[PDB]
Amino acid sequence: AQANEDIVVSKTSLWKEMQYNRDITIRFKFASSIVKSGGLGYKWSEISFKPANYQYTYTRDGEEVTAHTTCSVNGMNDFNFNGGSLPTDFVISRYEVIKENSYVYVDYWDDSQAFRNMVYVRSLAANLNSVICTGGDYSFALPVGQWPVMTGGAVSLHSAGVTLSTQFTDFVSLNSLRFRFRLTVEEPSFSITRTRVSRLYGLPAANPNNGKEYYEVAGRFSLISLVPSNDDYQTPITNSVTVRQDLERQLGELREEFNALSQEIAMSQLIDLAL
Amino acid sequence: AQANEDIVVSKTSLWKEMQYNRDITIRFKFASSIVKSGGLGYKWSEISFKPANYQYTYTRDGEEVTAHTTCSVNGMNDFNFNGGSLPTDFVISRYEVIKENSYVYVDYWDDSQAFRNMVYVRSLAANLNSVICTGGDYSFALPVGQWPVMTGGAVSLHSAGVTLSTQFTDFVSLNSLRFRFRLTVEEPSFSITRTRVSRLYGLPAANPNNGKEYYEVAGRFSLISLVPSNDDYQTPITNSVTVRQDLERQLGELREEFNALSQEIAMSQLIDLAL
Amino acid sequence: AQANEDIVVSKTSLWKEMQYNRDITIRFKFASSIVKSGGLGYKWSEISFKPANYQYTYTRDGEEVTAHTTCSVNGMNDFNFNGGSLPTDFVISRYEVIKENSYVYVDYWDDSQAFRNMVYVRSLAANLNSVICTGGDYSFALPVGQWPVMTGGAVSLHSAGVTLSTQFTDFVSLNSLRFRFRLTVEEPSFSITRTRVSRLYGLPAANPNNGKEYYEVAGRFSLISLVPSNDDYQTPITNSVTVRQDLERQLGELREEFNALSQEIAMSQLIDLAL
C-alpha cells in the first residue's frame, strides 16, 4: 500500500466510487485587518482577522504538486482598552484575540486527482499533528510621542474534526477540504509595551504570522468520492466575480463626497495663501 | 402516509431518485441600508433594501431542525422628497418602496435530508399561506429642528411560484429553495410626519420589521431530487471568502486619505488653542 | 447536421452523456474603475479594469435566446505618469494597459439546453473569429487649467484556448464557458493630449468601449456534458448574496465618521458666517 494511492471501490456505466489516501503539507497563513480612526491618531477603531489565501507549489515524492490554502478564525474574543475619553490618550476600541473558546478553520486544495471533480465525499478523516503559533511585533505608528508595540502571545493549534468547504475568490472557486483546529494557551503571553496590561493569554490579531511567510503543518487525508469513470471531465474552477455592486456604488458615492469635501477644504486653505 | 416523507421513486447502482415532502417554518426578516449624506445632516442620500440572512432552530414533530433563511426584494420603486435646495431643509434623495409590480424572494434551507446533497430537482411545488408585513417608526435624527418620523405602511404577501437558488455568505454556501411572493397593498399607508406627504401606499424601506424579531409563515414543499444511494455523502457548505480584494484596497486608500485629512483638520483646530 | 445539434453518445438509466454543437454570439463589454485622489483634483489614484457583466437577448434560427456574458482582463501592465510633486501638476499614480503579455477572459452563458445542468464537460473546443478592440476618449476633468484627453488605442483580440468558469453575481450564479483571447498590438496608439506622452501601443483602461454598447464576436462551441436522462431537472441559478458584511460594517463606520467630520466643518463655517 502506497502513501498516495488511488483505488476504485466501485464502477458503474458512467460514474465510479474512488478512494484517495494522500499526504499533504498545509502551508497556511493568517492576515490582519487594521483600521485607524480619524482625529489625531491615538484612537483605533478595530484590529481583526480576515480570511487569508496563500497558493504555492511543493514537492511530493517525485511529483510537483500545486496547492492552495485559505485560513480563517471564528469565535474570537473582542477585547478593548481605553485610557480615557481624550484625543491624546492611546485607545483601541476593539481588538480580536484567539483563545480555547474560538476555532481556526483551514481550507486546503491541490491540483491532484482527489480534487478535480470532488463534489461528493464520505468516510472523510485525517491525522494531523499539532503546531505552535506565536504573535508578532506590531508597532502602533502614533503621530507624536512614544511608540507602543503589541508583542507576544503564543497558542498551540490542536487537530480537530475534518469536513468539506468552498474557497471562493475573484479568480478561482475550489471545492476544498476543511481542517478544523482548537486552541490551548501557552506560556508566552501578549502585552502592549508602555501600558498597564500584561500577563493575559491568547494570540493578538495585529501580527499573528510573526513575520513568517507561512505556518506549516503536515497531514494525511483519506476519503471516498464520486468521479466520472472517464477521467476527462472538468468541473468549473475559474471565476469572473461582480458581487456587491451596490457596495461598489456606495463606495463611489463616498469617494465623490470625500473628493468634494477635500476640494472645499483645499480651496479654503489656498484662499488664505494669496497675499 | 406521512407529513415528512422520504420515498424512493427509483434507484440505481450509486445514484437514486428520492421524493421529499416536508412541512417548514419560513421565518424571514427584512433589512434596510440607511445612508446619510454629509453636510449638516438634513440631507439623506439613500434608504435602500439589503438581502437579509437569518438563521435559527425550530421544533418539528419531535425533531429539532436547524434552518437558515435569506430574504431579498426585486423590482422595488424609488421615491424621492426634496423640501428645498438649502442645507437646512429635510430632503431624502431616494427611499425604496415595495408595491404590486415588485416581488419578494425568500431562500430557505434546513439541515434535514432533502437539502444535504440537493443539486438536481424536478416536480418542485409548494403550498404557502399569506402573511402581513408592516412598517415601524424610523425617527430621522435631525441635529436641530423637529423630528420627522417615517411611520406606517402595510402590505399583504401572497404566495407565488417556487424555484431553486443558492445562498452565498461569508460562512456557508447553501443550495436552497426559492419561494417567491407577490404583493397587494393593504389599508395602512406609510407617511413621514411633520411633512407634506401622506396617503400613499407600499412598504417603507426604513423599518420594515416593525421592531419584530422575524416574520413567520408556515409552508410545505415537495420535490424529487437525485442523491447518492449511499446516505453518507456530504456536499461542501462552509466557506472562506476573499472576494472584492480590489474593493478592499480602494476602501483602504480611502481610509488613509480620510485619516490624513482628519489629521490636517485636527492640527488646524489644535494650533488655535495655545495662549 | 444542424448548426444547433444535440446528440446522445451514451445513456444509462438516470444519467446520459449528451453532445452539443451550437453557434453563439458573444456580446461583451469592458468596464473601467476611476478613483480620483483628494486635494484639488490634479492627482488620480487608479484607472483600472473591473469585471463587467452584460445580459442580452439575441435571435437564433427561429428562436429567441437569452444570454449572460462577463468580461475580465488578466496580466495587464501598470503604467503611471507623474510630472511634478506639487498639487497643481496633472499626475496619474497608476493606470492599466493591455499588451501581448495580457489576456482577456470572457465567460458566456445562455438559457439553452447546453447550460441547464452543466457541471461536467469534456471534448471541449470552439471556433472563434478575431475582432479589434479600440479605446475611446476620456477627458480628465481638472479643476482649472487645460483638459488633457486620453484618446486612442487599438488592439486585436485573437481566439485562444477554452475552459469552464463560474459567473458569480448578486442575482444569478452560472456554470459558464470561459473563452480566452490573446492580444496583438495594432497601429492606432493611445496618447494623453497636452502632455509629454504619445506613440505607445496598447489599450487604455478609461474608455475601452469607445462609446459602444458592446463588442460583438460570433463563435461555435462543441462539448459533451452529463445531463440527467429526465429532461425536467434544474440546477440552482439565482442567488441572494450577503458576503463582505465586515466590509459593509467598515463602510458604515467610515460614513459615520465622515458625516461627523463634514458636520464639524460646516459648523465651523456657520459660526464663521454668523456675525
UniProtKB/TrEMBL annotation, chains A, B, C:
Coiled coil: 237-264
Bridged cysteine pairs (disulfide): C71-C133
Region Spike body and stalk (antigen domain): start-end pairs: 1-232
Lineage, highest ranks first: Viruses, Riboviria, Orthornavirae, Duplornaviricota, Resentoviricetes
Localization: Virion
Region of interest (Hydrophobic), ranges: 142-162
Recorded superkingdom: Viruses
Protein name in UniProt: Outer capsid protein VP5*
Occurrences of domain Rotavirus VP4 membrane interaction (ranges): 3-227
Taxonomic source organism: Rotavirus A (strain RVA/Monkey/United States/RRV/1975/G3P5B[3]) (RV-A)
Motif (YGL motif): 201-203
Full protein stretch here: 248 to 522 of 776
